[PDB]
Design a binder for this molecule. Sequence first.
Ligand SMILES: NC(=[NH2+])c1ccc2[nH]c(-c3cccc(-c4ccccc4)c3[O-])cc2c1
Lengths: 9, 246
Amino acid sequence: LKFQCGQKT
Amino acid sequence: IIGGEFTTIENQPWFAAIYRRHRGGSVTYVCGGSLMSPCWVISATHCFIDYPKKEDYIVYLGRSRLNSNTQGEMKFEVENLILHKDYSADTLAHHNDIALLKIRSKEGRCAQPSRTIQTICLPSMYNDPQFGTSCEITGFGKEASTDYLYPEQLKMTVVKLISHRECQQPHYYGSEVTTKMLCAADPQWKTDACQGDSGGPLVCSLQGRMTLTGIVSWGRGCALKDKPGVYTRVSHFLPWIRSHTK
Ligand SMILES: NC(=[NH2+])c1ccc2[nH]c(-c3cccc(-c4ccccc4)c3[O-])cc2c1
């Protein structure tokens, strides 16, 4: 989706 | 990385792999880097200093391997290469070893978010984790100081932040280490970054976010007793970063 710094998925 | 485990980019989705093109056909790996915003990657100035021709560098995001492709990877050209005015190298140390690369793809775009491409968070002004915090580092650098090849699979390891008092002890690095650098080592001097890991990230959780706390810069040897790895202290360069990434 859009970037969310530091979140790994 | 000496020690560590082999991983995949999904476990470090902000890691950027930078290579250099040669006349003759080969492209070689240069350094690691990190994605801070869609169009900006941060690395270390000494990685480019001796060959500052932006047109010959290629940046890849979403890569778990060094010379083979990974599905999902993105390839970019370097639109702007910003080195740090005041970068300095002496025996062992590199001062102000931070650099910015603005990336653009052949279609004219910046990075797109996926399970293999994510940005890392920046610390707040002069804010760092306390020493003792465990942070992770990643890269394609050597696995043993005596090797002459880099691994094909990405590696990661955990290291702990140590204090400047401990790092500036004469029998460690003395005054070579400044307030604009950070030191990290393994309590038992077993794992560490090594040649080939320069420019990549030192990530720690800060205020609930996985934050870019350091950039792999130098170290005497790799995993040597009393010779911690030294990193650029990103929290002390936030005005500089801002100055170009605005
Ligand atoms: N022991 C450590 N903690 C450590 C970390 C990063 C390093 N990078 C290097 C390094 C050595 C020779 C050349 C480069 C270099 C120079 C120009 C372009 C790219 C890499 C290095 O980053 C050593 C080195 C050692």
